[PDB]
Amino acid sequence: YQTAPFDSRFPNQNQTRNCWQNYLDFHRCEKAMTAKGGDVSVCEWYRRVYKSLCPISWVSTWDDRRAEGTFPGKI
Amino acid sequence: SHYEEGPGKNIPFSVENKWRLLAMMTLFFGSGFAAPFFIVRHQLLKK
Amino acid sequence: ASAAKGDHGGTGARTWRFLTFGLALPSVALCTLNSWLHSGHRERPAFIPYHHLRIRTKPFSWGDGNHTFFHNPRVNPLPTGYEK
Amino acid sequence: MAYPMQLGFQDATSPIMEELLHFHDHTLMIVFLISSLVLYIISLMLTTKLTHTSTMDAQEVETIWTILPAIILILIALPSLRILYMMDEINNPSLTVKTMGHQWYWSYEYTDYEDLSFDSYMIPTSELKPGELRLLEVDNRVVLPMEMTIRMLVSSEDVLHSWAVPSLGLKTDAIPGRLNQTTLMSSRPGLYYGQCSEICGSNHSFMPIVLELVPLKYFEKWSASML
Amino acid sequence: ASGGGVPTDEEQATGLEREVMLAARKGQDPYNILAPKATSGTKEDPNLVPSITNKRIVGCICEEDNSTVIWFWLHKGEAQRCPSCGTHYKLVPHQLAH
Amino acid sequence: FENRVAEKQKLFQEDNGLPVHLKGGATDNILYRVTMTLCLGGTLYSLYCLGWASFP
Amino acid sequence: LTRFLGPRYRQLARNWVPTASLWGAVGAVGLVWATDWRLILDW
Amino acid sequence: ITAKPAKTPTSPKEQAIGLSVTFLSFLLPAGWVLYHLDNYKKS
Amino acid sequence: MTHQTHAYHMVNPSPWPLTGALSALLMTSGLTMWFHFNSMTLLMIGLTTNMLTMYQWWRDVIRESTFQGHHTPAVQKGLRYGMILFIISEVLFFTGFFWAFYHSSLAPTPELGGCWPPTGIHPLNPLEVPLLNTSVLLASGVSITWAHHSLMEGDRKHMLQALFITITLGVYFTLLQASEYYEAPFTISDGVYGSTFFVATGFHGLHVIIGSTFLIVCFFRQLKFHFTSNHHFGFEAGAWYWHFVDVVWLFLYVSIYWWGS
Amino acid sequence: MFINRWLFSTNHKDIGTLYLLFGAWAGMVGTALSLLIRAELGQPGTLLGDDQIYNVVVTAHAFVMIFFMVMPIMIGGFGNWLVPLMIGAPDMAFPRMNNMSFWLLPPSFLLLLASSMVEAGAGTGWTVYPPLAGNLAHAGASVDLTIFSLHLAGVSSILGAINFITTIINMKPPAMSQYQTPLFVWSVMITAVLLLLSLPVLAAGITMLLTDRNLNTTFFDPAGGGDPILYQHLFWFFGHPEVYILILPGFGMISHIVTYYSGKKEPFGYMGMVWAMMSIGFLGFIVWAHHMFTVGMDVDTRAYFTSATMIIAIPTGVKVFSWLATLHGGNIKWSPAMMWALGFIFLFTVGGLTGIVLANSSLDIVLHDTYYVVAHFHYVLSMGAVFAIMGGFVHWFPLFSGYTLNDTWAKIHFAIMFVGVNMTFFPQHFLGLSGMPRRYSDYPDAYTMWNTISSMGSFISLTAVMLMVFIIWEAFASKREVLTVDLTTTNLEWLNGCPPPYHTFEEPTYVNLK
Numbered sequence A: 001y002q003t004a005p006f007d008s009r010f011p012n013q014n015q016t017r018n019c020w021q022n023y024l025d026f027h028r029c030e031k032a033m034t035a036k037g038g039d040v041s042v043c044e045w046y047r048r049v050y051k052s053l054c055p056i057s058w059v060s061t062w063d064d065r066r067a068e069g070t071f072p073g074k075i
Numbered sequence B: 001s002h003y004e005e006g007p008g009k010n011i012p013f014s015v016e017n018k019w020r021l022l023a024m025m026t027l028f029f030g031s032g033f034a035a036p037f038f039i040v041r042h043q044l045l046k047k
Numbered sequence C: 001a002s003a004a005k006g007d008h009g010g011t012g013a014r015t016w017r018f019l020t021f022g023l024a025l026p027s028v029a030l031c032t033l034n035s036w037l038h039s040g041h042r043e044r045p046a047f048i049p050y051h052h053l054r055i056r057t058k059p060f061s062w063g064d065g066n067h068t069f070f071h072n073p074r075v076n077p078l079p080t081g082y083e084k
Numbered sequence D: 001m002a003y004p005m006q007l008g009f010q011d012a013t014s015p016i017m018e019e020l021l022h023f024h025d026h027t028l029m030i031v032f033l034i035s036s037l038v039l040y041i042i043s044l045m046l047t048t049k050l051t052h053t054s055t056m057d058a059q060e061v062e063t064i065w066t067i068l069p070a071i072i073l074i075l076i077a078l079p080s081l082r083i084l085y086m087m088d089e090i091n092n093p094s095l096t097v098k099t100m101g102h103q104w105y106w107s108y109e110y111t112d113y114e115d116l117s118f119d120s121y122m123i124p125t126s127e128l129k130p131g132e133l134r135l136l137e138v139d140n141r142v143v144l145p146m147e148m149t150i151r152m153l154v155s156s157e158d159v160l161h162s163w164a165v166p167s168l169g170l171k172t173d174a175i176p177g178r179l180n181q182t183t184l185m186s187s188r189p190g191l192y193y194g195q196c197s198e199i200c201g202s203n204h205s206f207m208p209i210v211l212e213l214v215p216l217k218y219f220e221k222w223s224a225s226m227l
Numbered sequence E: 001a002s003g004g005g006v007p008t009d010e011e012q013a014t015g016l017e018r019e020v021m022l023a024a025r026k027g028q029d030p031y032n033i034l035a036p037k038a039t040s041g042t043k044e045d046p047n048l049v050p051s052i053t054n055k056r057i058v059g060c061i062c063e064e065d066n067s068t069v070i071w072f073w074l075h076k077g078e079a080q081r082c083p084s085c086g087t088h089y090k091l092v093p094h095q096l097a098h
Numbered sequence F: 001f002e003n004r005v006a007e008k009q010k011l012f013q014e015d016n017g018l019p020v021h022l023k024g025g026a027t028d029n030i031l032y033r034v035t036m037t038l039c040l041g042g043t044l045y046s047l048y049c050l051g052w053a054s055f056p
Numbered sequence G: 001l002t003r004f005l006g007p008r009y010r011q012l013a014r015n016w017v018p019t020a021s022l023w024g025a026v027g028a029v030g031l032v033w034a035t036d037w038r039l040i041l042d043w
Numbered sequence H: 001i002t003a004k005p006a007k008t009p010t011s012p013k014e015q016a017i018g019l020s021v022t023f024l025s026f027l028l029p030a031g032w033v034l035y036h037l038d039n040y041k042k043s
Numbered sequence I: 001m002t003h004q005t006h007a008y009h010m011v012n013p014s015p016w017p018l019t020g021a022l023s024a025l026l027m028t029s030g031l032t033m034w035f036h037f038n039s040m041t042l043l044m045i046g047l048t049t050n051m052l053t054m055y056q057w058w059r060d061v062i063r064e065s066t067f068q069g070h071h072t073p074a075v076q077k078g079l080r081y082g083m084i085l086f087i088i089s090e091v092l093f094f095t096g097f098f099w100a101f102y103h104s105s106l107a108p109t110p111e112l113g114g115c116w117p118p119t120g121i122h123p124l125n126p127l128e129v130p131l132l133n134t135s136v137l138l139a140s141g142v143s144i145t146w147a148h149h150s151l152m153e154g155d156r157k158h159m160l161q162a163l164f165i166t167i168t169l170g171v172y173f174t175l176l177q178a179s180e181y182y183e184a185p186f187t188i189s190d191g192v193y194g195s196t197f198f199v200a201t202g203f204h205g206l207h208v209i210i211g212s213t214f215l216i217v218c219f220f221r222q223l224k225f226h227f228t229s230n231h232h233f234g235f236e237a238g239a240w241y242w243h244f245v246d247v248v249w250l251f252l253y254v255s256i257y258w259w260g261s
Numbered sequence J: 001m002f003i004n005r006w007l008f009s010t011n012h013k014d015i016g017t018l019y020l021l022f023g024a025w026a027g028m029v030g031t032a033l034s035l036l037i038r039a040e041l042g043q044p045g046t047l048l049g050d051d052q053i054y055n056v057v058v059t060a061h062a063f064v065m066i067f068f069m070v071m072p073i074m075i076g077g078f079g080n081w082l083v084p085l086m087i088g089a090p091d092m093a094f095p096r097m098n099n100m101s102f103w104l105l106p107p108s109f110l111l112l113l114a115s116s117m118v119e120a121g122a123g124t125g126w127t128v129y130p131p132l133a134g135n136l137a138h139a140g141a142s143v144d145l146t147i148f149s150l151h152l153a154g155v156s157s158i159l160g161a162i163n164f165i166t167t168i169i170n171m172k173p174p175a176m177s178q179y180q181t182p183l184f185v186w187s188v189m190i191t192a193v194l195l196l197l198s199l200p201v202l203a204a205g206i207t208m209l210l211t212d213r214n215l216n217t218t219f220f221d222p223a224g225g226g227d228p229i230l231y232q233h234l235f236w237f238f239g240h241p242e243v244y245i246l247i248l249p250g251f252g253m254i255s256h257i258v259t260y261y262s263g264k265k266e267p268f269g270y271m272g273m274v275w276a277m278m279s280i281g282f283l284g285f286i287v288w289a290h291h292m293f294t295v296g297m298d299v300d301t302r303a304y305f306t307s308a309t310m311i312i313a314i315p316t317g318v319k320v321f322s323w324l325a326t327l328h329g330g331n332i333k334w335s336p337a338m339m340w341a342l343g344f345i346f347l348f349t350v351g352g353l354t355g356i357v358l359a360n361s362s363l364d365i366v367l368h369d370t371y372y373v374v375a376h377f378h379y380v381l382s383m384g385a386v387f388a389i390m391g392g393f394v395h396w397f398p399l400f401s402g403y404t405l406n407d408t409w410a411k412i413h414f415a416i417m418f419v420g421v422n423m424t425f426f427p428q429h430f431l432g433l434s435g436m437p438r439r440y441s442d443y444p445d446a447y448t449m450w451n452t453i454s455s456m457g458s459f460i461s462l463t464a465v466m467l468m469v470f471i472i473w474e475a476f477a478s479k480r481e482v483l484t485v486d487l488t489t490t491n492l493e494w495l496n497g498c499p500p501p502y503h504t505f506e507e508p509t510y511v512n513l514k
């Protein structure tokens, strides 16, 4: 892995959703592999991407939101 | 209409004495040009 | 979802007065009943301190500066949580 | 960077900036043609005692002067649009850096692998070491690998700001709550300066950008010693 | 439906409104609401320009599609001619004025 | 009901050399002066507030 | 009550306001000496 | 465009006066404020 | 010369423009006091002189047209144009708000939950009272038309009857809308959904009140026999404004109440 | 008496005079502000201070010149003075409303002056974009006052737009078609329409900005799900039409001036000229986004806006070439006004040519927010809009006043101002190509030469606007009354003598229906 590659579904100057989508995706996958075990398999790809593209402050605040349960996205 | 007509009469300022006029034009345009300078001064003297 | 109906080719005041009491007003009555029947009082929504809601960047120019204008305590919580 | 008494663009450090210089030359050649044509016609009109104040037939000449400008506009539009798409082109970057505008400084974040992040502030003209540029030097340069396709992601943590670096032909506004993307690709090592290109308050003029481009090897050792 | 009760112009119109209302039914036009129809304009058949004084500005659209109206004062007296096309115009006293 | 527009037409068409906003009597006059007074005063009050707020 | 109200009366009212207006000013002056508002004194 | 001679001609001296005055009225106030800039910047 | 021979109206010098301009100053700066130095006295005075100005300015217009007869045909055709044009500038005013709404709802930011309506918002039901408000406004559209037709046919009683029915429906909507506001489980402060909702439906609300006082004015002018079966621009306008108002509600309903919720 | 005439007016001529007086005075304030700007940039370092006090100055400069000098003068001044006279109308359709339009201006100006006094003023840029304009980065009454000033100025302009369209459409002689009215009248009728459709969207935008900072709304706040870019769209939707609203009446005056001094009856290609302004007015509504090339929009849409913006050159071209064709066989008179008209034709061409360059999104990436764009609009505004104002002013002064100006002095004034503005704005093309950003109180050492030369030119301009004031004084001091005027057959405005009487066209104008 070098860095998050080009994503056809996010082909323009605005990557906001790119960061957003992968952050969701990861945490959604995480929750599932947890509540299923399935040998606690892990969705690292999504985390590699979201960490690269999402500025720290967003990830941080989102994590906090997820902590207090005020995170607006559906995971 | 008792509104006077003709040169020098269709304006809101007297043009009969050239020097009174000089004074008026001077205050008019003058006060307009000085305002920004005094505003900057005012802003520089605040705290 | 309609298409249209009874044509009465000549429209004068009698026609509009006819539509007023024979269509317009009766509808206002039906819908009134409908809305009077579907008058289900929703239980005040669960409070959860979402950050994109109950915004406050400057206290309102009235009251304690934390109460929106048509504030209904029953269904509107303060940022902190429901009124009482 | 810009030198004393400069007339045109700063020298192109990247290929699209080169591409732009050539397009500008093309476009400028035309504005010289038209602007001199008009001036000639004007002086021509005002230089004869001969008169013809009666009625003159329009429309006839009206086509020449409506079809011509139309052709010329295509001659500019075509090259322009090509370069336009060439910029928003499908490339695969080998690195992703983020920059976040702040009220009076930029902060960078290299986070592909490790969480490296620092603040870039302008060096007060008072504490400049001889030979350092008055309003352009920053304390922490943003180090990056030359000859590589980097993906920059610009955003802000407060008001609007604009991250720009003329030599590379880049400029992207920094809008809070938004991730704007841009492709950086220097074809030569060095120090490349830029400045905030968006009004953002009291120190809008004092929050510069300095790119320092070294080879990969030195880039990675820098990156580590940075944490 | 059925009934009545609202006033009419003929019975409730006043001031200048009424004046143009009546004047209009007699076929006359004292407040220049209509466009004056041209005569042959010859020295013998001049366009008659009514006026409430002794001079009135005449605007002459020489040729039908012209974008330029030629303007000039028509004085009391002998017929006068549009500077760009002859065309005679002769002042005449303005009758109805109330 | 009534219908006495005819009386008012006459009242307002009366050649008393009065401007329409006064052609109707004494109340027109008091209304005018009240309005004018409130406006000027208000304007004065506003200038005071601005002079006051200009300072720290 | 109703009898007092009239279309004709307005000139008297206008005249009264000035005399009344002048009278109103006197009270403020009269009250003020007794009142002694620091703000009034400041004025 | 033709015109009658000046009803009240403005001799050169008169012009020189009006020109000087016009200039001063613009230049003085600004000059003063600008002259004292530093005093303001230092309170 | 001396006596005019054109059908136009040379209006007498009025102090009202000055008075209304001063009013605008007072209300704007007054809002600035309310918003910042917590004071309404200035805002109160401005609202006052403003009503005073409108009352008088429009009183005179009535005087000049109905009592003095200055509204000749040419003068009227000009008033028609003016109204149309005004309504137009209004249509474009509301367009800023639908732009805002669509902008937000079509591309919901992640801070909202990346969806619409944002998570946490409980939209009202279009099929309940919003549906009622819709039918009320629409009915007043048919009744104001009946009024217009009676007027042209000189039917005094009926025009009055229809104008009355129309007016009450406008009031009924105002009350209904007022209660909706109070019962709404969201506020102006509830992010972009609340902003978008309360200011668009709110400005429209203000317009229904402005349109209702206009029809009221028309009502009384009729009680006083001001209108003739043929010259009643004051009503034509009131009517045009009233329709502009239903139409704006139709877009609000469909866009904000139905689609964007 | 004075009150009734000057405060309670219903006269198109007097209201128009009131405007010119307001515009000239506002023009002094704007000039002062432009000098502080160049004073600050005329030597490396800081004269005033931080970009706040500086940008407060830059902002007031823009608002004052755009909303208080150019618009009042061209539309309210020349608009009210000349329109009725050119179509033979007794006055305007709504004499009273017309007065409110004017009186809304002084208060509007007060609010703007007040804004820079309280707190630290508004250092937001004339675009007053959020988050900088918000209640956090710009807390206090300032921006709010800037917003209210804009509301009034907008109410004033759309009320007047309503008046001009109604008058122009409804009050011409019964036999006169629209294709028989003069270009200036067409010019303001079209400008009036742009105002009617753009101004309301602005008011929608800034009202949203006002609630965002006082009523806790989040139209442009990401936190609540808002978007700072949304404001950019709304503002610029008005923002572009606004600049055409600023040059159109100028186009008209130029058409009148060039034709008159060429001794011609009418301008070349009158219907082409009408078509041109109509096209310009229309395309001007579908190109706003060219002001947002570096904001992060889709490449495709970015491509649309550069193309759409470029086709405006065609109609503008037919106008430039038509004025040239007008000069053709003319018997030229080298009067002051003709000098202003020629300057405009060239300078405006250069400035608009320079705008075609910026039309390209690719190139605009490196040109946006630099002094290149400052050069573009000062060429079209300082030597475009302003040159038209001066030509129109010196050309019609006798009509408005009855007195004449000293032509030689008037010519000296052109010479000085022509040198001044070019020296001021020419260098700025370089500063921009070389990277000097906009809205900076100081710059890197390299930009010192051009900024110096630039600032020197602004002092020459100062000299010229001082001389002009004098030139007006002398005219009024000497009192040479107008006797004869040429070409009145084709120029109605002059038929009632200088100055026309309080009441003109009391008895209509006679126009035959061929």
Ligand code: HEA
Pocket: D034, D068, D069, D070, D072, D073, J243, J244, J246, J247, J290, J291, J293, J309, J310, J312, J313, J314, J316, J317, J318, J320, J348, J349, J350, J351, J352, J353, J355, J356, J358, J359, J360, J364, J367, J368, J369, J373, J376, J377, J380, J381, J384, J385
């Ligand atoms: C009256 C003022 C005025 C006028 C008329 C114009 C006219 C034009 N302007 Fe504008 N412009 C401004 C004032 C004006 N502008 C202002 C105030 C700003 C900055 C605002 C801000 O952001 O603060 C600005 C900003 C600005 C930008 C954005 C810069 C940036 O911030 O990145 C752009 C880009 O498209 C632009 C383009 C144009 C174009 C294409 C025209 C066209 O109308 C030009 C048309 C003229 C010609 C083309 C020449 C004549 C025609 C011919 C001789 C025909 C033959 C020629 C060819 C075939 C090319 N302008």
Ligand code: HEA
Pocket: J020, J023, J024, J027, J028, J031, J034, J035, J037, J038, J058, J059, J061, J062, J065, J066, J069, J070, J073, J124, J125, J126, J127, J374, J378, J381, J382, J385, J386, J389, J390, J393, J421, J424, J438, J439, J440, J458, J461, J465
């Ligand atoms: C009408 C438009 C107008 C005009 C004419 C001018 C004229 C001047 N402006 Fe400009 N300026 C703007 C509108 C205008 N400006 C705008 C919109 C901005 C953008 C602000 C922003 O970035 O937010 C700007 C920005 C701006 C900048 C950039 C600042 C920065 O971004 O850091 C500079 C700097 O040089 C500047 C300077 C000047 C100068 C030197 C003049 C000189 O040329 C002035 C010369 C004096 C005159 C031409 C006025 C004389 C005319 C009259 C007084 C009329 C008299 C009346 C009668 C005859 C009846 N202006």
Ligand SMILES: [Cu+2]
Pocket: D101, D102, D104, D160, D161, D162, D196, D197, D198, D199, D200, D204, D207
């Ligand atoms: Cu910045």
Ligand SMILES: [Cu+2]
Pocket: D161, D162, D196, D197, D198, D199, D200, D201, D203, D204, D205, D207
């Ligand atoms: Cu900045």
Ligand SMILES: [Cu+2]
Pocket: J239, J240, J243, J287, J288, J290, J291
């Ligand atoms: Cu533009």
Ligand SMILES: [Mg+2]
Pocket: D197, D198, J369
């Ligand atoms: Mg920008």
Ligand SMILES: [Zn+2]
Pocket: E060, E061, E062, E070, E082, E083, E084, E085, E086, E087
């Ligand atoms: Zn003829």
